[PDB]
Symmetry: D2
Subunit: 265 residues, 4 copies
Amino acid sequence: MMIRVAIGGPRGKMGQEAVHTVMNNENMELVAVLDHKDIGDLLSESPNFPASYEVPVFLNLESLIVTIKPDVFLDLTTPHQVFEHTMLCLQNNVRPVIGTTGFTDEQLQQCTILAEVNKLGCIVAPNFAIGAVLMMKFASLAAAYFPDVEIIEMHHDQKLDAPSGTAYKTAQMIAEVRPSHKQGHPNEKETLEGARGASYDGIPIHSVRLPGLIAHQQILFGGEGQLFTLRHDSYNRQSFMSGVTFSINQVMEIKELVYGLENIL
Amino acid sequence: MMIRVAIGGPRGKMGQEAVHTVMNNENMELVAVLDHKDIGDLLSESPNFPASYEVPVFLNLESLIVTIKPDVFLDLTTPHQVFEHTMLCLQNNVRPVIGTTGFTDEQLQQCTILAEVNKLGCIVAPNFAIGAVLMMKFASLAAAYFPDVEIIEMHHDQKLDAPSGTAYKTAQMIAEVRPSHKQGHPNEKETLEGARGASYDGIPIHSVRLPGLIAHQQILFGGEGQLFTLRHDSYNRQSFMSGVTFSINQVMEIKELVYGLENIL
Amino acid sequence: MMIRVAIGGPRGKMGQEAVHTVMNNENMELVAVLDHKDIGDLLSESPNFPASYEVPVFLNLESLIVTIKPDVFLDLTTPHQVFEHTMLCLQNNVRPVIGTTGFTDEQLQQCTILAEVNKLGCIVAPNFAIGAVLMMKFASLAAAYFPDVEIIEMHHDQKLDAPSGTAYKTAQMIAEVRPSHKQGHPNEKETLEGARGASYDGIPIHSVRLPGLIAHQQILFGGEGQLFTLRHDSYNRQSFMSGVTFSINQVMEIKELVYGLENIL
Amino acid sequence: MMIRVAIGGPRGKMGQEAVHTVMNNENMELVAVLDHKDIGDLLSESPNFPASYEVPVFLNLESLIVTIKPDVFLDLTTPHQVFEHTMLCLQNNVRPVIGTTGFTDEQLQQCTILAEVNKLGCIVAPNFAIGAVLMMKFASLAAAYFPDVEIIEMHHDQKLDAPSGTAYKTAQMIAEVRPSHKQGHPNEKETLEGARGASYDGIPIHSVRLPGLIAHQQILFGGEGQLFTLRHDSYNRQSFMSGVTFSINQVMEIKELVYGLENIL
Ligand SMILES: O=C(O)c1cccc(C(=O)O)n1
Ligand SMILES: O=C(O)c1cccc(C(=O)O)n1
Ligand SMILES: O=C(O)c1cccc(C(=O)O)n1
Ligand SMILES: O=C(O)c1cccc(C(=O)O)n1
């Protein structure tokens, strides 16, 4: 059936893309947004979400829920609001799809148990890019056969952290499967400090930062006589959208909370 | 427990590698070979398999089986011999791992049924390179999320067929999942014939042939704002060996016939 | 000294980038544009170039030249106007940098001779992307050492022509150096038509068309035991800008007409 | 004319390839080797260079020179012998091509001056792989246009040094052209030590070590909206041979000493 979607935080960089995605998906209708602005935001610099009869703007989620009764709520707001949003949806027969981290352990347990008792789907997706998540999922399967692996991630030269969050998560996922070991000859020595990169559980990770690049990762699996590589290249925030689409479709089909798209792709 | 292995066709390019692999695997012992030479093979050009007490040479498989009672028979002989070999093993409590094609439909059905009734493992592996098979397996999973794909395969410049067998199999595997469609703008036109490549069920396939190269494949999955690529590079026949190893280990654990390592990785 | 630049066709996709480039380059000042609109262009859909005192809009180039006396005129207009523009600049001590093709043989000869007699620089740049032009220039140098080469170009799936103009030019440039020969085993045969691609003077060219991609080319040089690859990836029209910048800087230094940035990088 | 070649150190890994190369080159004849064995080398483990009338074995270079009068001497011996060899050739009208380092500054100056006065060619080639040297040469040209660059080198997992000698030389060559600067955001911070790699004059260098790999390097040049990459992959010591071939051909044509094939490709 049609899926009636409300979006929290439509004006964010991700939010703007999600709006366009939901509006363009044949089987989805954007029916409301949860939104509010900084009290000092000049309209000339920081416009309102555009006024329409078809997509009313609410300040309060309870009110949105009771008035619009969306099937799904896509939360692209902030870590400090996700728990209260999720619980509110789950108690009102709305499936929440949450696009940021921020739950405590205890908070997540409460949402998980509530989803299960209500037999209502919930997806928490710290990464919506299906290509990035498949990359990670497949890497952790591959690591059963090729325990020697390196990760190379590349981003634009304004990025403040190295390695990337994606690279860290990737290494964590591999390390669930791959026996812990270091790599490289036991007696190798760097003659220029840092050449071998960082190490997560023995997995080398290298971080490239150059103008021009957006977000890119390769995972290299070595073995006798061969190399098996997984690679993801993201050129813009549309890379996230097939994950938004999949999440909204799939939340309607499941009856429990799933954390991480790797657990359902 | 230790796995006692006999190899048919030890002197082949693949056979030579398989010999070394089995001899070097901690939990395996090479206990016999099935071998024979062309009556015109001068020893100076085409040496005998090297004489040893530990690895006796048999001309007849029945005799090898009764005398040596191997756990596993690794068949690297020819398509015209695989069926008779497989049946003989299956009736004598030997697990056959077959490394070439050549069964008829009817032949395969007979081996499958016999394996099942005897509760004895059999693996038929048209491709032993785990990296190549993972590539294909993962591609067919990925194609559920990214229906637009191209295959680029690259080989040395002595190769007679284009596209490669691997590329064909890859396209067949993808096409099980991917809805049939052509790709590229409906009105595109080649101004130099062939630029867009070959097409298998709408999937473009491109074949590179250059000195220097060995055997290489990339699978490119496009979607909005991103590219997800799987790649395998083989530099020599050791690329096959982890598949030989996995097959020998795994045949001991299963109680039926499996055709294609994608069905058990 | 500062370089005072006027741009013809500021509202084009390329023009818009060139405007931003010139405005942001420390040693350049945008002093005028040559521009005019379709008589049916509603302002609401097709806005005017934005009004400013610093960048006056002219309809007639002669008038721009006499009034503003720019050092350089960057022509991003159309093939049918480039010759008249170039000649007008060259006769008025303005260095023209022309960013589209469209000269006849006879037309180009006239501009070349006039530039030489006036000792005034002119650059005609059919491709402003320095990375793409270096790729081509280096490929033609490499082809002296590695005569066996293939070209793989990849674009978005709205592109109408295969192969790309860049791929064609690349093949033409290589073919100046590389002895003419076909590649691949003499007896190879395609079992799926088109797998080996198109051929330009024996050079195979393959064309990939996928959503997600922008504009990409790899040139693969094979030889014994090795592969040497040149690759260019363009994610947006800023890829062109370092070529615009280089052309404007370099036209001031030369005293003759140069056709193709490969001839001066 | 035919080029009559003698090789010093024919039994080395490189030497063996050079022997095959010279023997297979149409315009070259292998006419002698300079060779000797360790006094403890059992013939069963460490065979003699194979006896032939066409390729006599000498222990002393002076004797080889006077007896055989080769056109070219290819020195694949050791750093402690190259100077004495080079001088001896240069004084006897033999062109030396030297395939290992080991000269002092003063030693090289003596050979350079002697070559120049005798108008006799000499090539010193610390790297014979033309694809690797072109990569480096082209990188240093590219760095004039794209000052932001990173180097990724990849080798097998038995390699003791990181980064590679090739990567170091590459960085040195780039740094002749590229203005010295660091890259990445000024405030970036590693949260896992080493992620950003090593730095040579601000150029990041990353070192991958995996089974399967042989010797591989990519050089990534970033700029607005684009990436320009140079890559070399070596699968065996034949990668060196086109450089041996080029060096022997080119030494006959030059009348002075050239150090590094980048200076003559
Ligand atoms: O994994 C990450 O940290 C990541 C992913 C996409 C973009 C960026 C970024 O631009 O910083 N960072
Ligand atoms: O898929 C194939 O056809 C294939 C695989 C490995 C090597 C070769 C070959 O060398 O021909 N061909
Ligand atoms: O070489 C070409 O033809 C080319 C270059 C950049 C973009 C495009 C395109 O988008 O069509 N085509
Ligand atoms: O640049 C180098 O250091 C290099 C080049 C080729 C091979 C190797 C190696 O195997 O160590 N190292």
